[PDB]
Structure 1
């Protein structure tokens, strides 16, 4: 069982509440970063930055950010130092996010999937192991070093 930080604007809110209940039922500890109620006009970035910041700060935890499409949400998460947020739109991409990218977070577009599809995405995300494979780690290290220095790494050739 794992702590999972969730953040969502109004467009992801209802799906977020469903995911929280699903995660409880499957033995996880969901932590709601907000929104705590439906507010049709609310703004995703704060919730996504909160979820990403909290996830990165909490070893072994994962996070999930939801909105209409999930794309603004993952962009916002990805601005957090050390955060790696994939956009998960299928079981395959949720799984690869963990296996290849060691993503601590995924974005999900609430308007893009049925609830069943979304929960299947969440299941793949929370159950797929990070591979620890050499080449994937190398690539993550390159990105982390760019985050640290903003020195663009040279392109081969």
Structure 2
């Protein structure tokens, strides 16, 4: 049972609403950050920053942000302090985003998948645990430290 914050522009709006329904059906708690209706001209950043900000502030939660490709949306979510947003374009990448990257959010492209494919990506994301493996935590900590100071760490 996961709480999931969702954000989308117009290009991801229709898939977002379908995902919200699916998440309800499969025992989860979706929270819609908008867009709340289709608006052809609307701008992705606000919705993605909102979902990402709320996700980071609510530990244990996850997030999903949607656009055409999903890339603008993961980019915007990733600007939020503490947020790690993968682009999920397959079951495997959704799974690995959790397992390796402890990603609290994924971006999905509404123009990229069938509904069946998208929901499969969503299922993998909400059910795959974070592995807690040492090397992954080490890498996440390194990135977290860069985010704290914006001082580029030295390369080997």
Could you tell me the TM-score, scaled by structure 1's length? 0.99
Please report how far the alpha carbon of residue 3 of structure 1 lies from its aligned counterpart in structure 2 after TM superposition: 0.8
Write the deviation string for residues 12-50 of structure 1: whole angstroms up to 9, x where unpaired: 000000000000000000000000000000000000000
Structure 2 CA distance, aligned partners of 1:46 and 1:150? 23
Write the deviation string for residues 60-82 of structure 1: whole angstroms up to 9, x where unpaired: 00000000000000000000000
Structure 2 CA distance, aligned partners of 1:150 and 1:42? 31
Question: CA-atom RMSD, angstroms?
Answer: 0.3
Task: Verify: 1:52 aligned to 2:52, yes or no.
Answer: yes
Q: How does 1:94-105 map to 2 (within 5 A)?
A: 94-105=94-105
Please report how far the alpha carbon of residue 2 of structure 1 lies from its aligned counterpart in structure 2 after TM superposition: 1.3
Structure 1 CA distance, aligned partners of 2:39 and 2:102? 33
Structure 2 CA distance, aligned partners of 1:60 and 1:128? 13
Which segments of structure 1 move beyond 6 Å, counting only runs of 4 or more?
none
> The residue matched to 2:140 in structure 1 has which SS?
helix
Structure 2 CA distance, aligned partners of 1:2 and 1:121? 15
Please report how far the alpha carbon of residue 112 of structure 1 lies from its aligned counterpart in structure 2 after TM superposition: 0.3
Structure 2 CA distance, aligned partners of 1:80 and 1:59? 14
Structure 2 CA distance, aligned partners of 1:29 and 1:14? 18
Please report how far the alpha carbon of residue 113 of structure 1 lies from its aligned counterpart in structure 2 after TM superposition: 0.2
Could you tell me the TM-score, scaled by structure 2's length? 1.00
> The residue matched to 2:151 in structure 1 has which SS?
coil
Structure 2 CA distance, aligned partners of 1:63 and 1:98? 12
Structure 1 CA distance, aligned partners of 2:130 and 2:137? 10
> The residue matched to 1:152 in structure 2 has which SS?
coil
> The residue matched to 1:103 in structure 2 has which SS?
coil
How many residue pairs end up in the alignment? 156
Structure 2: gaps of 5 or more residues: none
Structure 2 CA distance, aligned partners of 1:35 and 1:71? 17
**1:68 corresponds to which residue?**
68
Structure 1: gaps of 5 or more residues: none
